[PDB]
Design an enzyme around this catalytic site. Structure first.
Site, PDB file in Angstrom:
ATOM      1  N   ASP A   1     -10.459  22.993 -14.794  1.00 51.82           N
ATOM      2  CA  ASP A   1      -9.959  23.964 -15.750  1.00 51.82           C
ATOM      3  C   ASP A   1      -8.438  23.994 -15.855  1.00 51.82           C
ATOM      4  O   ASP A   1      -7.862  25.039 -16.151  1.00 51.82           O
ATOM      5  CB  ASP A   1     -10.481  25.354 -15.397  1.00 51.82           C
ATOM      6  CG  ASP A   1     -10.101  26.409 -16.440  1.00 51.82           C
ATOM      7  OD1 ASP A   1     -10.350  26.199 -17.659  1.00 51.82           O
ATOM      8  OD2 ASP A   1      -9.549  27.453 -16.026  1.00 51.82           O
TER       9      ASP A   1
ATOM     10  N   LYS B   1       0.528  39.986  -8.630  1.00 49.31           N
ATOM     11  CA  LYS B   1      -0.543  39.918  -9.603  1.00 49.31           C
ATOM     12  C   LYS B   1      -1.603  40.980  -9.331  1.00 49.31           C
ATOM     13  O   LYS B   1      -2.144  41.056  -8.241  1.00 49.31           O
ATOM     14  CB  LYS B   1      -1.149  38.526  -9.548  1.00 49.31           C
ATOM     15  CG  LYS B   1      -2.332  38.298 -10.443  1.00 49.31           C
ATOM     16  CD  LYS B   1      -2.763  36.852 -10.328  1.00 49.31           C
ATOM     17  CE  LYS B   1      -3.647  36.464 -11.494  1.00 49.31           C
ATOM     18  NZ  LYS B   1      -4.287  35.139 -11.254  1.00 49.31           N
TER      19      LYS B   1
ATOM     20  N   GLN C   1      -7.253  36.331 -15.676  1.00 47.50           N
ATOM     21  CA  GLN C   1      -7.405  36.842 -14.311  1.00 47.50           C
ATOM     22  C   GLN C   1      -6.706  38.207 -14.140  1.00 47.50           C
ATOM     23  O   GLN C   1      -7.184  39.067 -13.392  1.00 47.50           O
ATOM     24  CB  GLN C   1      -6.832  35.816 -13.314  1.00 47.50           C
ATOM     25  CG  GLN C   1      -7.193  36.045 -11.834  1.00 47.50           C
ATOM     26  CD  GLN C   1      -8.426  35.269 -11.383  1.00 47.50           C
ATOM     27  OE1 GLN C   1      -8.513  34.050 -11.584  1.00 47.50           O
ATOM     28  NE2 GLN C   1      -9.381  35.968 -10.766  1.00 47.50           N
TER      29      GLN C   1
ATOM     30  N   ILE D   1      -2.760  40.822 -14.760  1.00 47.04           N
ATOM     31  CA  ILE D   1      -1.378  41.111 -15.112  1.00 47.04           C
ATOM     32  C   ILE D   1      -0.467  40.752 -13.943  1.00 47.04           C
ATOM     33  O   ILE D   1      -0.806  40.987 -12.788  1.00 47.04           O
ATOM     34  CB  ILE D   1      -1.172  42.597 -15.415  1.00 47.04           C
ATOM     35  CG1 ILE D   1      -2.218  43.068 -16.416  1.00 47.04           C
ATOM     36  CG2 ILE D   1       0.230  42.816 -15.999  1.00 47.04           C
ATOM     37  CD1 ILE D   1      -2.291  44.567 -16.498  1.00 47.04           C
TER      38      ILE D   1
ATOM     39  N   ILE E   1       6.292  39.778 -16.466  1.00 52.62           N
ATOM     40  CA  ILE E   1       6.606  38.357 -16.649  1.00 52.62           C
ATOM     41  C   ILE E   1       5.478  37.591 -17.309  1.00 52.62           C
ATOM     42  O   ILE E   1       5.503  36.362 -17.362  1.00 52.62           O
ATOM     43  CB  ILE E   1       6.955  37.636 -15.316  1.00 52.62           C
ATOM     44  CG1 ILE E   1       5.857  37.857 -14.281  1.00 52.62           C
ATOM     45  CG2 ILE E   1       8.305  38.108 -14.804  1.00 52.62           C
ATOM     46  CD1 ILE E   1       6.062  37.044 -13.005  1.00 52.62           C
TER      47      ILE E   1
ATOM     48  N   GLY F   1      -2.629  37.253 -18.434  1.00 53.25           N
ATOM     49  CA  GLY F   1      -3.659  36.306 -18.807  1.00 53.25           C
ATOM     50  C   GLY F   1      -5.063  36.859 -18.611  1.00 53.25           C
ATOM     51  O   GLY F   1      -5.299  38.070 -18.734  1.00 53.25           O
TER      52      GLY F   1
HETATM   53  O1  LIG Z   1       1.951  33.857 -14.558  1.00 57.69           O
HETATM   54  C1  LIG Z   1       2.832  33.655 -13.713  1.00 57.69           C
HETATM   55  C2  LIG Z   1       4.259  33.389 -14.114  1.00 57.69           C
HETATM   56  C3  LIG Z   1       4.596  33.365 -15.503  1.00 57.69           C
HETATM   57  C4  LIG Z   1       5.933  33.110 -15.925  1.00 57.69           C
HETATM   58  C5  LIG Z   1       6.941  32.873 -14.952  1.00 57.69           C
HETATM   59  C6  LIG Z   1       6.626  32.892 -13.562  1.00 57.69           C
HETATM   60  C7  LIG Z   1       5.312  33.147 -13.132  1.00 57.69           C
HETATM   61  C8  LIG Z   1       4.965  33.163 -11.662  1.00 57.69           C
HETATM   62  N1  LIG Z   1       5.643  32.990 -10.475  1.00 57.69           N
HETATM   63  N2  LIG Z   1       4.643  33.159  -9.488  1.00 57.69           N
HETATM   64  C9  LIG Z   1       3.385  33.427  -9.983  1.00 57.69           C
HETATM   65  C10 LIG Z   1       2.126  33.662  -9.427  1.00 57.69           C
HETATM   66  C11 LIG Z   1       1.019  33.914 -10.306  1.00 57.69           C
HETATM   67  C12 LIG Z   1       1.199  33.924 -11.723  1.00 57.69           C
HETATM   68  C13 LIG Z   1       2.507  33.681 -12.260  1.00 57.69           C
HETATM   69  C14 LIG Z   1       3.617  33.430 -11.337  1.00 57.69           C
END
Ligand SMILES: O=C1c2ccccc2-c2n[nH]c3cccc1c23
EC number: 2.7.11.24
Length: 347
Positions: free
Chosen positions: A145, A49, A31, A33, A26, A29
Site C-alpha cells: 500500500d 498522531k 489513520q 490527525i 501539519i 489522513g
Molecule cells: O503526516 C505526517 C507529516 C506530514 C507533513 C510533514 C511532516 C510529517 C511527519 N513527521 N513525522 C510524522 C509521523 C507521522 C505522520 C507524519 C509525520
C-alpha cells in the site's frame, strides 16, 4: 497530580502529556490527525498522531494494533520511529484515544511531487525508499500500500516510510486510493515481494511527471489508464488470470500503450548537460523495469538497488544487515480489539 492538558488544533482536541508543548497542525489522513510539537524531556521536536477510537471497526483496529506492535519491534533508518505511546484515559471502560509520538519530518512525498528534483536528490530518495522496502521484506512484511502520503522526508533529504501496509466493508470519509496498487493485486492474482516495486514505480513516475500516473475512480477505471499508457499485457500473462477475470480483461479494448521515452520525455528531467541527459535515460530505464504489468518480468528490490541510477548510494551496511529478531492474525470483535489495543498501550 494530572500529567495531561488539552489544546485545540484544527477541528479536533488533543489531550497530551505536559511534556509535549506548542502543538501545531501539519496535515491529516485516513489513520488520523497529526501535529508538530516540542518535547521538553528529550529537548527536540516530535510528531504526535492521534488515533481516535482505533477499535471502531475490525480493519481499522487491526491496523492500529499491528502498526503499534511493529513500530516498537522494527527499527530501520528508513522506517518511521515510534518515540512514545499513551492514552489520556485511565480505565479500559473510558479508553478512547491513542497518541503515537514519532520523529518529526519536514514534509510528506505529496509535496515533493509538486516540485522538480535533480538526479542526485531523486535517486537518493528512491534509494532510501527501496532500502526501507528491503528491510520490511526481510522481516516477512510486504507493504502493498505504498503511496506518497505514507512517506515523509526532511530537508537533509532523509526519508522514512510511515505505516506497514495492508495485512471488511467501509463507508467512512477515508478515500478509496488504489492508484498505486499492483495489477496482480487488482485482478485478484497472487502476489510476492516485488509487488512493492510497482508502487515505487508509480511513485517515481509521479515524481517525474508530477501527476498521478493512473487516475482511477474505481478499480475498473484504473485498469484502463494502466493499459492505455503501458499497453495491453502479453497473452501469456492473461493465461494466468482467473476465468471470471481473464474474460473481462481479454474482452477489454486492446492497446499499444505509449513508449517510455514518450511517457517520460527529456523535458521532465534536467537536460542541463550530457551527464544529466545520461542520468535521465538511466531513470527512464529504471522506470521501464519497475512499471511492468506482469510481475514475472518486473524487476526485484535487490536488482533495483543495483540499478546504475540507484547504485550510487549503495552501502552493504544499510542493505545487508540482521533484521529484528505476538504476531496476531485472528479476527476479533470491537470489544476484544479495544482491550487488546488498551493492554498494548498500557503494556
Ligand atoms: O503526516 C505526517 C507529516 C506530514 C507533513 C510533514 C511532516 C510529517 C511527519 N513527521 N513525522 C510524522 C509521523 C507521522 C505522520 C507524519 C509525520
Amino acid at each position: 497530580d494530572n500529567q495531561f492538558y488539552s489544546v485545540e488544533v484544527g477541528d479536533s482536541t488533543f489531550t497530551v502529556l505536559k511534556r509535549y508543548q506548542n502543538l501545531k497542525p501539519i496535515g491529516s489522513g485516513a489513520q488520523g490527525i497529526v501535529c508538530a510539537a516540542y518535547d521538553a524531556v528529550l529537548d527536540r521536536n516530535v510528531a504526535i498522531k492521534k488515533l481516535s477510537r482505533p477499535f471502531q471497526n475490525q480493519t481499522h483496529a487491526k491496523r492500529a494494533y499491528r502498526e503499534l506492535v511493529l513500530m516498537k519491534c522494527v527499527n530501520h533508518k528508513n522506517i518511521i520511529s515510534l518515540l512514545n505511546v499513551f492514552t489520556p484515559q485511565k480505565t479500559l471502560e473510558e479508553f478512547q484515544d491513542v497518541y503515537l509520538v514519532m520523529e518529526l519530518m519536514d514534509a510528506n512525498l505529496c509535496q515533493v511531487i509538486q516540485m522538480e528534483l535533480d538526479h542526485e536528490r531523486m535517486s537518493y530518495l528512491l534509494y532510501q525508499m527501496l532500502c526501507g522496502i528491503k528491510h520490511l521484506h526481510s522481516a516477512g512484511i510486504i507493504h502493498r500500500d505504498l503511496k506518497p502520503s505514507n512517506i515523509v522526508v526532511k530537508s537533509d533529504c532523509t526519508l522514512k516510510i510511515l505505516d506497514f501496509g495492508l495485512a471488511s466493508f467501509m463507508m467512512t470519509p477515508y478515500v478509496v486510493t488504489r492508484y498505486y496498487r499492483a495489477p496482480e493485486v487488482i485482478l485478484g492474482m497472487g502476489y510476492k515481494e516485488n509487488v512493492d516495486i510497482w508502487s515505487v514505480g508509480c511513485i517515481m513516475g509521479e515524481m517525474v511527471r508530477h501527476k498521478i500516473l493512473f487516475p482511477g475512480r474505481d478499480y475498473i477505471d484504473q485498469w484502463n489508464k494502466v493499459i492505455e499508457q503501458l499497453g495491453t499485457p502479453c497473452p501469456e500473462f492473461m493465461k494466468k488470470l482467473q476465468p471470471t477475470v481473464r474474460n473481462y480483461v481479454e474482452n477489454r479494448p486492446k492497446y499499444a500503450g505509449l513508449t517510455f521515452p514518450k511517457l517520460f520525455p527529456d523535458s521532465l528531467f534536467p537536460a542541463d548537460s550530457e551527464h544529466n541527459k545520461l542520468k535521465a535515460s538511466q531513470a527512464r530505464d529504471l522506470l521501464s523495469k519497475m512499471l511492468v504489468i506482469d510481475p514475472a518480468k518486473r524487476i526485484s528490490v535487490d536488482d533495483a538497488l543495483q540499478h546504475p541510477y540507484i547504485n550510487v548510494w549503495y552501502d552493504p551496511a544499510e542493505v545487508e544487515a540482521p533484521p529484528p529478531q505476538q504476531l496476531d492474525e485472528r479476527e476479533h470483535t470491537i470489544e476484544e480489539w479495544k482491550e487488546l489495543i488498551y493492554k498494548e498501550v498500557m503494556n
